[PDB]
Each structure stands twice: as structure tokens, then as C-alpha cells.
Amino acid sequence: KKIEHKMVAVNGLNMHLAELGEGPTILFIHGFPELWYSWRHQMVYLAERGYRAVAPDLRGYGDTTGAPLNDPSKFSILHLVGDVVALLEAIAPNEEKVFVVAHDWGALIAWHLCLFRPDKVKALVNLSVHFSKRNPKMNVVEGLKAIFGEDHYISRFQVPGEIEAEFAPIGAKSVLKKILTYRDPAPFYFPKGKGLEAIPDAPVALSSWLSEEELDYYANKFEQTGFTGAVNYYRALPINWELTAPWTGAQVKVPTKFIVGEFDLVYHIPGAKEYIHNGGFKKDVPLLEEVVVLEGAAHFVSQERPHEISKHIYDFIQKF
Numbered sequence: 001k002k003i004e005h006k007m008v009a010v011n012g013l014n015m016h017l018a019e020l021g022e023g024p025t026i027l028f029i030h031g032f033p034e035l036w037y038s039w040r041h042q043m044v045y046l047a048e049r050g051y052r053a054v055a056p057d058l059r060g061y062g063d064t065t066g067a068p069l070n071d072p073s074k075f076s077i078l079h080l081v082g083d084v085v086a087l088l089e090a091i092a093p094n095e096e097k098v099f100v101v102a103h104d105w106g107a108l109i110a111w112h113l114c115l116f117r118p119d120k121v122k123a124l125v126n127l128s129v130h131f132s133k134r135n136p137k138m139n140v141v142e143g144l145k146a147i148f149g150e151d152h153y154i155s156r157f158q159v160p161g162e163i164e165a166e167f168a169p170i171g172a173k174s175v176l177k178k179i180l181t182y183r184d185p186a187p188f189y190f191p192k193g194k195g196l197e198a199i200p201d202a203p204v205a206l207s208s209w210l211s212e213e214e215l216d217y218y219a220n221k222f223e224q225t226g227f228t229g230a231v232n233y234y235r236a237l238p239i240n241w242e243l244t245a246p247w248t249g250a251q252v253k254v255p256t257k258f259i260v261g262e263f264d265l266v267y268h269i270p271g272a273k274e275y276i277h278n279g280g281f282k283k284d285v286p287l288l289e290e291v292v293v294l295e296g297a298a299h300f301v302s303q304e305r306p307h308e309i310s311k312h313i314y315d316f317i318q319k320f
Contacts, residue, residue: 003043005063008056010086011079016063017091018055021047024099025092026317028055029084031104031128033179033230034300035062037217041306042101042313049314051099054091058106059083060229062221069228072160072235078243080109080233081116088120097122099317103302104128104266105233114254115247123255123320125313127301128266130258130276131284134248139241141234144187147270151198153188157234163190164227170195173219175227180215181207183298185268209304255287257316259309261297289316 004019018036020043028039036055043053057064068074092098100121102110107129114121145155157163167175183202260267282288302309
């Protein structure tokens with residue numbers, strides 16, 4: 001069978017769901033600036049081994065409609081987890097708990113899904129983004145701006161319309177190619193009026209995992225939707241910080257496997273490596289397995305290392 005596509009009405013949205021396979025449900029959750037399509041390899045691998053792979057486009061992404069692009073406050077972590085809980089109730093009505101696999105912004109959603117509703121998740125595979133322990137002093141935007149300055153991507157993303165206008169003459173294809181093929185451990189910089197000039201290029205042979213046809217899929221979709229929906233997630237970071245105060249000191253009680261690429265910029269945020277490897281991560285996530293670091297890999301591991309990611313998912317969920 002080929003990948004099936006449907007629309008599901010959830011939490012004020014009409015959500016696009018891609019689906020492949022039969023058996024126990026695995027929910028895949030993409031990140032920025034990606035789509036359901038990022039899971040193409042894993043959907044096939046897991047479906048051929050007796051699982052039902054389900055991959056939505058998130059709020060403000062791809063074929064999912066209903067989100068007010070003009071109101072970034074509606075892209076809060078609470079709205080996002082609300083979407084996922086409602087989705088699961090609709091598409092998995094006979095499984096109290098399901099498997100969850102997620103990456104980047106999807107991983108951040110998955111952490112909070114597990115904090116808010118651990119009764120819904122049997123086991124979790126998170127990629128790239130480690131558990132974000134709430135800093136009582138300041139929000140993520142302010143914290144990263146203090147370290148990396150005004151041109152840091154999360155800071156430049158803040159005012160609605162600004163980064164959109166920067167990307168406009170460049171076009172979705174060039175923006176996406178530059179982002180998807182990025183390999184340097186430093187964060188993205190978007191100096192005003194400089195477009196993509198501040199982002200270094202890696203040797204071309206290192207991005208052979210991304211075909212022109214695959215690039216075109218992302219490009220065509222984001223040229224239709226624009227980038228506002230996706231970028232609004234970062235614009236909600238300040239309110240996310242306020243809204244998540246009730247979960248200070250709370251633990252994720254779901255069995256978890258964490259995987260990250262050696263050169264992933266998120267992995268190189270100051271303090272991240274120490275948090276992940278020296279005990280802090282295990283304290284917040286007591287059922288965390290041994291952390292997996294993919295040698296020679298960068299941020300987009302599901303596409304860059306599809307066999308390794310697929311096998312790591314299969315081997316982990318087989319334990320249950």
C-alpha cells in the first residue's frame with residue numbers, strides 16, 4: 001500500500017494526517033522547518049515490520065489548516081499539546097497508550113505531552129532536543145539572546161513579518177536548502193538585510209542524503225503556506241515560559257530513548273552536553289535510556305541517517 005492522506009478535525013484545526021501500515025500505533029511528530037514528509041523513511045521501515053505509522057502536519061504547517069497566522073499566542077505549547085491529545089483521541093481510540101517518536105519542535109511538544117498526560121504514552125523516542133528544564137531567571141529567547149546576541153535566529157524570529165520579509169526575495173527553496181544542509185555547531189544567524197549570507201556552507205558531498213525531489217517537496221509546500229505558522233512557535237516561547245511554571249521540579253515518567261547528531265547546534269547550546277551526560281537529564285527523566293550520539297551526523301537525523309534512526313526506533317519499541 002502507498003501512504004494514505006486524510007484530514008482530521010482536532011482542537012479548532014483541520015489537521016492533515018499521513019498514514020502507513022497496520023498494527024500498534026506510532027505517532028511521529030516533526031519539527032522546524034519540516035513536515036510529515038520528514039518521516040518518509042521511518043514510516044516505511046516500521047510499517048513493513050507490523051506497526052501503524054501516523055505522521056501529522058502540525059498546527060501552522062503544510063496541509064494543516066485553521067490556525068490564526070496573525071496571532072502567535074495561539075501557537076503556545078499548551079495549544080500544541082492540545083492538538084496532539086485531541087488527535088490521539090480521534091485516530092487511536094482503542095489504545096490507551098501509544099508509541100511516540102519526535103524531533104526538534106516535535107520533541108519539545110512530546111516532552112510536554114509526557115508531562116501533561118503520561119497516561120497517553122507507552123514509550124518515547126526523542127531526537128535532537130533534550131528536556132528543557134525551566135530556567136527560573138528568564139525565558140529561552142532572552143537567555144539565548146544574552147549568549148549569542150541580537151542576530152541569533154530565535155531573536156530575529158520574534159517580530160511578526162520581519163523574518164518573512166527577509167525570506168521573501170530569497171524564496172522558500174533556497175531558504176530550505178540552506179537550513180536543511182547546515183552542519184556547523186553554531187546557531188543560525190540572520191543579520192538584517194543580509195539574507196542567508198551568515199550561514200556557512202558544508203562540502204556538497206555531505207548533503208547527498210537530500211535529493212532535489214525531496215528538497216522540492218518542502219519548497220513547494222512552504223512557498224504555498226509561507227513561514228509564519230512555523231515561525232510563530234518561536235514567537236510563543238516567552239508565553240510558554242510563563243505558562244509552564246506549574247511543572248517546575250516535575251519529572252517525565254515515560255520510558256525514553258534520546259538520540260542526537262554529533263554536530264547538532266541544539267547539542268552545542270552552552271550547558272547542554274553537561275545537562276545531558278552528567279546527571280541532570282536523568283534526574284528530570286528517570287526512565288531515560290543510555291543517550292545515543294550519532295557520530296558524524298548533524299541536526300536532521302531522520303533524513304541524514306534514516307537506517308540508524310529507523311532501527312533505533314524499532315529496537316527500542318520492541319522492548320515493550
